[PDB]
Amino acid sequence: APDREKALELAMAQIDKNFGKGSVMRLGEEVRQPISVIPTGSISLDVALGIGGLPRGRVIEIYGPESSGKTTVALHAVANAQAAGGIAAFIDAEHALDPEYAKKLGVDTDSLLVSQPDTGEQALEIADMLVRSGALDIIVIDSVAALVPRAEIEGEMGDSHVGLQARLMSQALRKMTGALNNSGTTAIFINQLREKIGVMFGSPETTTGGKALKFYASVRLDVRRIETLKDGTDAVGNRTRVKVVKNKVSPPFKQAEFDILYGQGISREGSLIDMGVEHGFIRKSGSWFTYEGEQLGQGKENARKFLLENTDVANEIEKKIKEKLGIG
Description:
Structural class: alpha/beta
Subunit structure: Polymerizes non-specifically on ssDNA to form filaments. Interacts with and activates LexA leading to autocatalytic cleavage of LexA, which derepresses the SOS regulon and activates DNA repair.
Largest sheet: 9 strands, mixed
Binding site for phosphate: 67-71, 192
Strand order of the largest sheet: 5-4-6-7-3-8-9-10-11
GO molecular function: ATP binding; ATP hydrolysis activity; ATP-dependent DNA damage sensor activity; damaged DNA binding; single-stranded DNA binding
CATH topology of the largest domain: Rossmann fold
Shape: globular
CATH superfamily of the largest domain: P-loop containing nucleotide triphosphate hydrolases
Main location: cytoplasm
Number of domains: 2
CATH class of the largest domain: Alpha Beta
Family: Belongs to the RecA family.
C-alpha cells in the first residue's frame, strides 16, 4: 500500500519535474491555489476551474457553436481584468463587437485597445509585439477561424495545404507562449464548431486550424447553450453550460452552468443563488428563498433582484461560498 503509492508519488514527482507541474493529476486533487487569477463573472465557472478564475500567463481556448456565449464569457474576463486596473487588447477579425453591450458588462471600452488586422499572420504578429511589451494582462483574439493566411487572401489554394493556415497558428502559437509565460498576460482565443447541422467544412481538434491550439492551450472551455430562459414573458437569455475539457492548472472535466441575460450578461446574482443553495447557505422552502434567518423574496427572480439591490448581503453570500471552497 505505502510501498505502492510511494513509488507512484515518486513517479508523478519526476513527471511534474520534467514536463511541468500539472502534467499528472488525480481528478480528486485540490490544487495548490495561486494568488493571481482572473474571475470569469460566474462563481460556478470560477470554482469549476479550480483556481477561482482564469490562470495568468497561459493561453485559454474558448469554443462552441455560434450564439453560445463565448464572447460574453471572454468580455467579462476583459472587464474584470480591467477593474483590477489591468490593460486589455482585442484583436478582431470578425468585425462583430458591440461596445454598448461590452460597456454594460463592465468593459471600459474607451481604454480598450482594439485592432482589426489585414491578414491572418499580421494578426498574430501584432498580438505578439503587443504581449512582448508586457504591459497587457489580457488579450483576446476574436475568431481562430477568421485569421486567414495572407496567401489565401491573395492567391494560393483554398482551405490550407496548397499554402499556409494550420501552420500559421503553430508557428505563432509557439513563440507566443514563452512571451506569455513571462509577461504574465493571459490570452484568450475564440474558436468555432463551424455549424449546427452540417456537411463539408473546416476543422482540426474539433475546430479550425487550431489543432495546435488544442495542445498549447492550458485551459479549453466548451461553451454551449442548454435552455432558453423566459420570464413569464419571452426570451430573456439562455442557460449556458460550460465544460472544462482541458485544464493544466487543475483537475479537468468539471462542469458549470449559469444564465446570460439578453443584453445584460452573466447573471452574477443568479450564479450566487444556485451555488447558494447547492451549498446550504441558502434554503428554498418552496419558491421562498431564505438566508440564515431573513428572507430573499419568492421565486428566483425576486431573489436575484434582491441580491441586486442588496450588494452588501450578496457579497456575503459570495464570500461564504468562496471561503467554504477555494479562494483566489
